[PDB]
Design a protein around this ligand. Structure first.
Ligand SMILES: *[C@@H]1O[C@H](CO)[C@@H](O[C@@H]2O[C@H](CO)[C@@H](O[C@@H]3O[C@H](CO[C@H]4O[C@H](CO)[C@@H](O)[C@H](O)[C@@H]4O)[C@@H](O)[C@H](O[C@H]4O[C@H](CO)[C@@H](O)[C@H](O)[C@@H]4O[C@H]4O[C@H](CO)[C@@H](O)[C@H](O)[C@@H]4O)[C@@H]3O)[C@H](O)[C@H]2NC(C)=O)[C@H](O)[C@H]1NC(C)=O
Ligand SMILES: *[C@@H]1O[C@H](CO)[C@@H](O[C@@H]2O[C@H](CO)[C@@H](O[C@@H]3O[C@H](CO[C@H]4O[C@H](CO)[C@@H](O)[C@H](O)[C@@H]4O)[C@@H](O)[C@H](O[C@H]4O[C@H](CO)[C@@H](O)[C@H](O)[C@@H]4O)[C@@H]3O)[C@H](O)[C@H]2NC(C)=O)[C@H](O)[C@H]1NC(C)=O
Ligand SMILES: *[C@@H]1O[C@H](CO)[C@@H](O[C@@H]2O[C@H](CO)[C@@H](O[C@@H]3O[C@H](CO)[C@@H](O)[C@H](O)[C@@H]3O)[C@H](O)[C@H]2NC(C)=O)[C@H](O)[C@H]1NC(C)=O
Ligand SMILES: *[C@@H]1O[C@H](CO)[C@@H](O[C@@H]2O[C@H](CO)[C@@H](O[C@@H]3O[C@H](CO)[C@@H](O)[C@H](O)[C@@H]3O)[C@H](O)[C@H]2NC(C)=O)[C@H](O)[C@H]1NC(C)=O
Ligand SMILES: *[C@@H]1O[C@H](CO)[C@@H](O[C@@H]2O[C@H](CO)[C@@H](O)[C@H](O)[C@H]2NC(C)=O)[C@H](O)[C@H]1NC(C)=O
Ligand SMILES: *[C@@H]1O[C@H](CO)[C@@H](O)[C@H](O)[C@H]1NC(C)=O
Ligand SMILES: *[C@@H]1O[C@H](CO)[C@@H](O)[C@H](O)[C@H]1NC(C)=O
Lengths: 238, 49, 220, 48, 52
């Protein structure tokens, strides 16, 4: 197989051009291989974008995007790239670069001339997250999901932290600097109509330890370089 | 051909390896085939059968 | 474009039992040019790139265990797992590449089947720090429930809400095979202060009757 | 693959074969009963 | 033969197909034949009497 290491700009403004590159290690980009680009919209199935043949310059594209997609290869650098113009919000997805072994590998000094390995997309890239949004990078807001008598069931109290209005993904949330892991659930983020993200990181602990053990959530947002430590305590009935 | 430059898409010039009288030797021969008698193998439009 | 129908869209299977996934194509996948049936199966494990499982209907990939095995002639294709294991959880896609464009299937989400468990519901009223920000969000949390299906309805003074609650579901837990759901309801300041009682009502197979958890604003 | 006579009775086998065109060989595979295949050498990997 | 088997088509050549075996559906159970014990014992006893 072949290691495919891909990079690119994962954050593009609407109506701009998305440029991704996939590098080939452990193999040659010139051959009977179909270098393919495939994207997965968030929460949907896989979708095929197109490919470029290794030997010739024959390229095929998705008919839905045939008038915007352009796939090129650079045999000197052993890389092939994807360019997608006039991107919209529908072009947010995770983009994988793959390789499909063709069915007419050239055989040298053998009884036959060609060889069909019966292989499909055997090599896949790690994927690149692409978000088509005009919103600028923004710092997260950390709010305390304080435990209460309403959040107790059989001596087990639920608490957490609500992280809202941050962009772009991702945000790493831990508890007690990673000391607390049991019962921790970090729900997947959601996209509101404002183009931001929000998610909830909750944890279930025994009620008797609410007043003895200090609970703090560490929220990190690398794109905006924001670190917030929020302490969660039961609401004060003043 | 010269006249083609001047229904010439009805035929193609196909070159293929043909086994000679000796089973261990092959010769690159050529022939002209009507497009109705050949179909593509791939979608690259270079190799037919 | 060939339309590729995968059934079932969700396949809960307990380890040790066989599983079967069916995939149908609107046209014959037998390539006329070279006679190969170009249908592949791929497994996208949670949070990983898709990986090859089966090449061209039946030819197993490299490093794929013996339990996986595909079949099918030209329009009805089947992927069979002889003995499902806990490491086979993921999404299975059937891809055709006989005709341009290449079309994947909907995707079968194979998960682990366990006993039905009722959710544990908690309510978190918006805090005063969020109160100062001009917006408020109330989350109603369901913990360790199975099946993943669960209906969350927000009632505001016994008035149903619509188009204002967003639901988030975690993936199946690797330890107890239970899901966690959280629905949040976001409202402005006049909207928060205009109403007093707030509740989230949950409907689940593991609950005999809908369970409603409520809080009154200004009270603990 | 057996649960566990009928366990060793069968063998996975991968080979090359001619396609419809007699100049290209395609790697195919099949299941063969051990009564239909005879080992070539003593290493127990190649059969016929 | 208890188990279902799956066929596979491999193109031998022009218009030639070779139907091979793909896999076995479900757990493998050996084929067998059942013969009534009493009836077979009686038949063998009778042929033994004739041979005697
Ligand atoms: C009928 O029978 C004939 C005779 O057998 C047969 O012709 C053969 O065609 C093949 C395919 O073109 C020829 O293979 C060429 O071989 C070399 C490379 O192979 C050398 O090195 C390998 C080890 O790596 C040795 O095993 C081998 O023996 C050779 O020494 C090149 O000339 C060709 O490869 C280049 O071009 C290919 C297509 O562009 C690329 O896939 C490949 O990667 C190479 O790219 C190079 O050139 C590119 C530009 O052209 C450039 O972009 C790249 O960077 C790079 O520089 C090719 O593979 C084989 O030699 C032919 N045999 C003879 C005797 O000439 C027919 O194919 C057969 N069938 C028909 C229908 O006619
Ligand atoms: C069906 O048909 C296909 C196509 O012909 C066959 O696949 C070929 O199988 C052979 C035998 O396994 C492969 O040859 C092996 O390839 C590997 C790479 O070797 C290459 O590179 C080294 C330099 O690094 C060269 O020395 C060598 O000549 C090759 O160019 C290695 O696994 C092997 O080489 C190593 O081992 C041998 C001895 O074991 C030493 O002599 C070598 O020096 C080296 O240490 C070997 O050469 C061949 O590459 C395959 N072809 C293709 C296109 O993949 C299938 O085997 C055949 N049958 C089946 C059942 O599928
Ligand atoms: C052997 O290969 C030939 C050549 O590819 C095959 O003939 C092809 O058969 C298909 C059958 O679906 C034809 O498609 C049909 O074409 C027209 C519209 O173009 C219409 O009748 C149908 O809607 C369908 O799409 C295809 O055109 C035809 N190709 C040629 C060049 O004649 C043949 O079927 C193969 N034989 C076997 C046994 O596989
Ligand atoms: C030939 O005769 C043998 C018995 O000598 C038959 O095997 C037996 O078949 C029966 C009926 O299917 C099996 O009973 C069932 O087995 C399982 C649990 O083991 C379950 O389905 C049922 O609860 C029931 O008990 C039995 O286990 C099986 N084996 C033995 C040793 O008795 C065989 O089916 C016969 N074959 C034919 C072609 O008639
Ligand atoms: C098979 O059937 C024969 C029928 O003759 C049985 O033979 C019996 O043999 C014992 C001594 O070996 C006698 O005492 C019995 O009277 C015989 N029975 C009859 C009905 O004649 C025999 O047992 C049967 N079973 C086997 C396993 O041979
Ligand atoms: C034939 O070749 C000439 C010279 O390259 C070219 O100008 C002409 O268009 C060709 N005619 C065809 C392909 O019919
Ligand atoms: C048959 O299945 C085994 C078990 O998974 C696998 O390791 C082996 O590679 C297969 N045989 C061939 C010839 O591919």
């Amino acid at each position: 197989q072949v290691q495919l290491q891909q990079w690119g700009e994962g954050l593009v403004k609407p109506s701009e051009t998305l440029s991704l590159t996939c590098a080939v290690y452990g193999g040659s980009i010139s051959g009977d291989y179909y270098w393919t680009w495939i994207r997965q919209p968030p929460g949907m199935g896989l979708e095929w974008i197109g490919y470029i043949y290794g030997d010739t310059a024959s390229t095929n594209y998705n008919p839905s995007l045939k008038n915007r997609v352009t796939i090129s290869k650079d045999t000197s650098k052993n890389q092939f790239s994807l360019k997608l113009d006039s991107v919209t919000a529908a072009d947010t997805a995770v983009y994988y670069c793959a390789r499909e072994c063709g069915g007419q590998q050239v055989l040298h000094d053998d009884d036959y001339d060609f060889y069909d390995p019966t292989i499909g997309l055997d090599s896949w890239g790690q994927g690149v997250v692409v978000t088509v949004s005009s919103a600028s990078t923004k710092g997260p807001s950390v709010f305390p999901l304080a435990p209460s008598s309403k959040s107790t069931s059989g001596g087990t109290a639920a608490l957490g932290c609500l992280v809202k209005d941050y962009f772009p993904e991702p945000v790493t949330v831990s508890w007690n600097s990673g000391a607390l892991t049991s019962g921790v659930h970090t729900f997947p983020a959601v996209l509101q109509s404002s183009g931001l993200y929000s998610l909830s990181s909750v944890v279930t602990v025994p009620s008797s330890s609410l007043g003895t053990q200090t609970y703090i959530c560490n929220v990190n947002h690398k794109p905006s370089n924001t670190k917030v430590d929020k302490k969660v305590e039961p609401k004060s009935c003043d | 051909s010269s006249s083609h430059t001047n229904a010439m898409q009805e035929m193609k010039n196909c070159s293929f390896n043909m086994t000679t009288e000796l089973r261990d030797k092959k010769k690159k021969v050529s022939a002209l085939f009507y497009k109705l008698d050949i179909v593509p193998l791939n979608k690259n439009g270079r190799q037919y059968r | 474009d060939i339309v590729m129908t995968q059934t079932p869209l969700s396949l809960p299977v307990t380890p040790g039992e066989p599983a079967s996934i069916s995939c149908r194509s609107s046209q014959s996948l037998l390539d006329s040019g070279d006679g190969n049936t170009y249908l592949d199966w791929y497994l996208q494990k949670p949070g990983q790139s898709p990986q090859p499982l089966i090449y061209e209907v039946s030819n197993r990939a490299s490093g794929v265990p013996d339990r996986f095995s595909g079949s099918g002639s030209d329009t009805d294709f089947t992927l069979r797992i002889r003995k499902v294991e806990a490491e086979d959880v993921g999404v299975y896609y059937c891809m055709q590449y006989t005709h341009i464009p290449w079309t994947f299937g909907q995707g079968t989400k194979v998960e682990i089947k366990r006993t039905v468990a009722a959710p544990s519901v908690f309510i978190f009223p918006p805090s005063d720090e969020q109160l100062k920000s001009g917006t408020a969000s109330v989350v109603c949390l369901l913990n360790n429930f199975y099946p993943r299906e669960a209906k969350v309805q927000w009632k505001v003074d016994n008035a149903l809400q619509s188009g204002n609650s967003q639901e988030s579901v975690t993936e199946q837990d690797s330890k107890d095979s239970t899901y966690s759901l959280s629905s949040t309801l976001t409202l402005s300041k006049a909207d928060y202060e205009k109403h007093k009682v707030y509740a989230c009502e949950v409907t689940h197979q593991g609950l005999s009757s809908p369970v409603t958890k409520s809080f009154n604003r200004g009270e603990c | 693959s057996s649960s566990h006579i009928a366990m060793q009775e069968m063998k996975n086998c991968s080979f090359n074969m001619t396609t419809e065109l007699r100049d290209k060989k395609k790697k195919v595979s099949a299941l063969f009963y051990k009564l239909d295949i005879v080992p070539l050498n003593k290493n127990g990997r190649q059969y016929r | 033969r208890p188990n279902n088997m799956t066929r596979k088509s491999i193109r031998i050549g022009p218009g030639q197909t070779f139907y091979a075996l793909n896999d076995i559906i479900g757990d493998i159970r050996q084929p067998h034949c059942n013969i009534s014990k009493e009836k077979w014992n009686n038949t063998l006893h009778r042929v033994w009497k004739k041979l005697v």
